[PDB]
Amino acid sequence: MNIFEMLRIDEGLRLKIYKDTEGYYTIGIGHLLTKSPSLNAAKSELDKAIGRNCNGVITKDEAEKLFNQDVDAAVRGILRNAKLKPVYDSLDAVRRCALINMVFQMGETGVAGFTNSLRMLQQKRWDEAAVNLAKSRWYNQTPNRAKRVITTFRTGIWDAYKNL
């Protein structure tokens, strides 16, 4: 398993504009288009993102391209972030994927706000950190996914995703 396979399990693949768990317009493999309520604003963003007239629909190909960009951006965002970088550098390869997943779902900003958990991960206090992460809107709103990510940080192995 790798970051791409992991995220593709968590996000799924939809070739038609759809709404977030959050009610937001998305397409592909969790690519948020807009937080705005118009399907029209969403369509516009889509076409801007793909460079063609899509009429709300994309190919698999286009979906993976957006996915490649999103993952690349997430990693580079971590690397540029004063709060995120040190944790990332301290982690092993599997846990690194868990942090990446959080950043992709919630943005640099949101994750960098998990101050106390970040601290604990840096310290390698796996069980404590798993308990702390769970005390969040994130976990209450998307419990199955949060629990997979949390197990990944806890164990450092890919079993949470084996099932899936």
Side-chain angles (χ1 to χ4, degrees):
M1 182 118 312
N2 63 59
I3 193 55
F4 290 96
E5 292 170 341
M6 187 198 207
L7 279 158
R8 145 108 237 223
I9 282 158
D10 285 334
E11 293 289 357
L13 171 60
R14 305 229 235 324
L15 297 179
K16 195 98 215 294
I17 297 193
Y18 72 95
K19 293 179 188 196
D20 262 51
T21 294
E22 261 172 76
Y24 314 128
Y25 287 129
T26 307
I27 197 161
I29 303 148
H31 182 85
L32 175 70
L33 293 161
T34 185
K35 289 201 196 177
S36 152
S38 1
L39 205 233
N40 290 315
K43 249 114 90 93
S44 169
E45 284 300 305
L46 176 67
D47 288 1
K48 166 168 68 74
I50 295 310
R52 74 190 183 60
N53 254 71
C54 298
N55 185 32
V57 63
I58 69 170
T59 64
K60 193 174 180 157
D61 246 63
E62 283 167 354
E64 309 183 308
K65 183 189 271 81
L66 286 185
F67 190 36
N68 285 150
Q69 296 170 174
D70 299 340
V71 174
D72 189 61
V75 171
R76 272 171 334 167
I78 283 165
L79 296 175
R80 274 188 285 98
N81 192 293
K83 272 103 185 238
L84 298 177
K85 184 189 200 320
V87 184
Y88 189 86
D89 284 348
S90 72
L91 294 169
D92 61 269
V94 178
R95 301 184 162 90
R96 276 167 181 179
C97 296
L99 190 63
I100 298 166
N101 193 130
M102 296 184 68
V103 176
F104 182 98
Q105 189 181 352
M106 93 194 4
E108 254 206 27
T109 301
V111 175
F114 281 53
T115 293
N116 303 307
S117 304
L118 288 180
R119 229 250 266 75
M120 282 167 248
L121 291 166
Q122 240 208 106
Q123 278 153 201
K124 312 208 179 285
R125 305 178 169 216
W126 316 128
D127 285 61
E128 300 93 308
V131 161
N132 193 260
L133 280 166
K135 251 80 161 246
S136 49
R137 185 199 190 260
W138 168 60
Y139 178 92
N140 290 98
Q141 261 350 270
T142 46
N144 290 157
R145 179 189 189 151
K147 104 210 327 165
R148 285 192 284 282
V149 171
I150 289 170
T151 296
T152 305
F153 273 135
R154 211 186 336 103
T155 65
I157 54 183
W158 290 112
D159 297 357
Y161 288 87
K162 233 51 127 155
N163 301 314
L164 296 2

